[PDB]
């Protein structure tokens, strides 16, 4: 049984961990972590010089990184070092496995804390437009994951999908952002036609420009809100990467996906790995982070639009039953051993004609 | 030796702890924690009703508080409860020992993260005026500590001080804010004359109004910047609660304090308990929090004024030597067993006439 003293100590340690997360975020954005990964043991002044930064700031940062047991300090020589085993997951050299990137979300949620608190009292939500930095970061992170794994790891989860794409299919990516996924797929699969759909006029224009740059005649982009579409029996394959649980009208989006698929078609929906039952998420790493991210961003943005507010932790069971509600009678859930955060939902449409 | 895997797990746990700190902050500001401390096990809807808050927000908050192992959830009945041993240090009923208050500093530092990051590149600092919420909270927290401990615990650390005040002394409080400390002392010690000095015209006016309210003829307030004072042999006793390490010109402030004291006088300076040597702070609870608070507030506000930027962790050794530089040849450091964050520096002035 946990005592008052033990709880006090655990919570003070959480406070220290929170400070440390912010320091790591600062370390990422300033290039300090990258800089120390390329240095031998060095003074505060040496580190600041190598980083091109103000030493007084670097010095205070170093102090907290040291008390947080990430940076190691040698008092005899007044030198600091970032152990290689830690550097390996806190630097840009790790790309999508750089955990310092996730640390940035602590400041990002903090920036909206007062706005979210108001919603506890007054209802509604904080609009999508309040989170430009948050969204920019998610887009960068997803770009790296698509580059690393989309073609060779993710698409092969769907039995027969790489051959179908090679042979030739009509494909859409719903919620395509700048069109990274469409770009990669259109390159890998010249026989297939790809349409990226996104709500942002800017993102769509950027997709179109980039497809023109690279001579990708088989990639087009279109601005639409995913809840209001006129696509009917248009696509053999539809991808949806992380977009559904944020929607104002997720059920209508899923219904639109089903309508847009041709008979024999397949939806690949990638969304957050968690249970729809709270008790199952207790003890699983990142569960608190996921509830917090939901409360302070993914849930509230949907509620701003008087939406469903399913949140980040909507969960496998609810996702599976909503796919059934949308008309899919054939749903499987795939996992990648090297991916703790995502489920890969594979939903196939009956071959039967209307 | 810590492995890559072990570091990965520890840092993911820090991320979860950071989320949990933000949730606790939200719990404090919304009254949710207070509400649950007065309830039996209850549903999300019951809790939201009791709190007067939007259930959908309460529900998501509950999820993260549960995965963070603060709130307990019973899946059989869908009820939540806040154990008494945890409630005891997360609710307003604990006053200055409410740890939920310290959790608010995570959002507060997050709100300034981008501004601080700019200073790593461009120098200078983030001005004091950027932190009104932060300062309001510190003032509330200090108010409660003064109410609880100033008269009966803190002032008795100085041998002979309560009797000297009872008998009659000229006293000043440097950095008095709204004048809480002066108010309490002026009430306890009718024979003594108290002057609160603060940089804020508003704080000073509020002090004066309140002294008029309560018929405290022996309490006055004056607006001055602590670095530029004309007080010479004016006071037998000077108090400085938490104000020195934030100053642009701390050495000049301490010199002004020494000049302002009469021969035989005493300074009571209360400031942060930590070492001036980084290696000593490693492993001490709250050290990371203190470096982070320094980097993102106390140090940077001083640097904004092209100041000393000593920071929150300036430390005992440096504080002691700066008191010597200011002219004090007689300095002791007192601790209160029930106070991990503050040192009590007692600096006495020679009895010898100019």
Swiss-Prot record, chains A, B:
Statement: the UniProt record of this protein carries the keyword Cell inner membrane: no
Cross-referenced SUPFAM superfamilies: S-adenosyl-L-methionine-dependent methyltransferases
Keyword terms of this UniProt record: Methyltransferase, S-adenosyl-L-methionine, Transferase
InterPro entries given in the database record: Methyltranfer_dom (IPR025714), Rv2258c-like_HTH (IPR048711), SAM-binding_MTase (IPR053173), SAM-dependent_MTases_sf (IPR029063)
Pfam families: HTH_65, Methyltransf_31
Keyword set includes Methyltransferase: yes
Gene Ontology MF terms: methyltransferase activity
EC numbers on record: 2.1.1.-
Cellular component terms (Gene Ontology): peptidoglycan-based cell wall; plasma membrane
Domain of life (superkingdom): Bacteria
Binding site for S-adenosyl-L-methionine: 142, 175, 198-199, 225-226, 247
Enzyme class: transferase
GO biological process, one term: methylation
UniProt comment concerning the protein's domains: Consists of two domains which are linked by a long alpha-helix. The N-terminal domain is essential for dimerization and the C-terminal domain has the class I MTase fold.
Family: Belongs to the class I-like SAM-binding methyltransferase superfamily.
Function: Probable methyltransferase that may target bulky nonpolar molecules with aromatic rings.
Subunit structure as annotated in this protein's UniProt entry: Homodimer. Co-immunoprecipitates with DarG in the presence and absence of darT.
PANTHER family, per database record: METHYLTRANSFERASE TYPE 11 (PTHR45128), S-ADENOSYLMETHIONINE-DEPENDENT METHYLTRANSFERASE RV2258C (PTHR45128:SF1)
Name of the protein: S-adenosylmethionine-dependent methyltransferase Rv2258c
């Amino acid at each position: 049984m946990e005592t008052t003293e033990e709880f006090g100590n655990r919570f003070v340690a959480a406070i220290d961990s929170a400070g440390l997360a912010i320091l790591v975020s600062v370390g990422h954005q300033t290039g300090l972590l990258d800089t120390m990964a390329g240095l031998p043991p060095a003074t505060s002044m040496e580190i600041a010089e190598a980083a091109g930064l103000e030493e007084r700031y670097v010095r205070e940062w170093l102090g907290g990184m040291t008390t947080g047991q990430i940076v190691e300090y040698d008092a005899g020589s007044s030198t600091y070092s970032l152990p290689a085993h830690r550097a390996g997951m806190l630097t840009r050299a790790a790309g999508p496995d750089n955990l310092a990137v996730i640390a940035q979300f602590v400041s990002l949620l903090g920036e909206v804390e007062q706005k979210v608190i108001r919603c506890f009292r007054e209802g509604g939500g904080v609009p999508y437009s309040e989170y430009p930095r948050f969204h920019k970061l998610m887009a960068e992170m997803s770009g790296m994951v698509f580059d690393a794994a989309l073609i060779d790891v993710v698409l092969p989860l769907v039995d027969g999908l790489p051959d179908r794409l090679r042979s030739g299919a009509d494909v859409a990516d719903f919620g395509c952002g700048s069109g990274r996924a469409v770009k990669l797929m259109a390159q890998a699969f010249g026989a297939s036609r790809f349409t990226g759909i996104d709500f942002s006029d800017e993102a769509v224009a950027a997709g179109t420009e980039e497809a023109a740059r690279l001579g990708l005649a088989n990639a087009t982009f279109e601005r639409h809100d995913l809840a209001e579409l006129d696509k009917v029996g248009a696509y053999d394959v539809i991808t949806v990467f992380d977009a559904i649980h944020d929607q104002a009208q997720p059920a209508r989006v899923l219904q639109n996906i089903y309508r847009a698929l041709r008979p024999g078609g397949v939806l690949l929906m990638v969304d957050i790995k968690a249970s729809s039952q709270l008790e199952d998420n207790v003890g699983v790493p990142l569960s608190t982070y996921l509830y917090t991210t939901s409360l302070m961003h993914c849930m509230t943005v949907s509620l701003a639009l008087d939406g469903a507010g399913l949140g980040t932790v909507w969960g496998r069971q609810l996702a599976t039953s909503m796919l059934a509600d949308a008309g899919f009678t054939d749903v499987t859930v795939a996992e990648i051993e090297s991916d703790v955060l995502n489920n890969y939902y594979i939903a196939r449409k009956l071959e039967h004609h209307h």
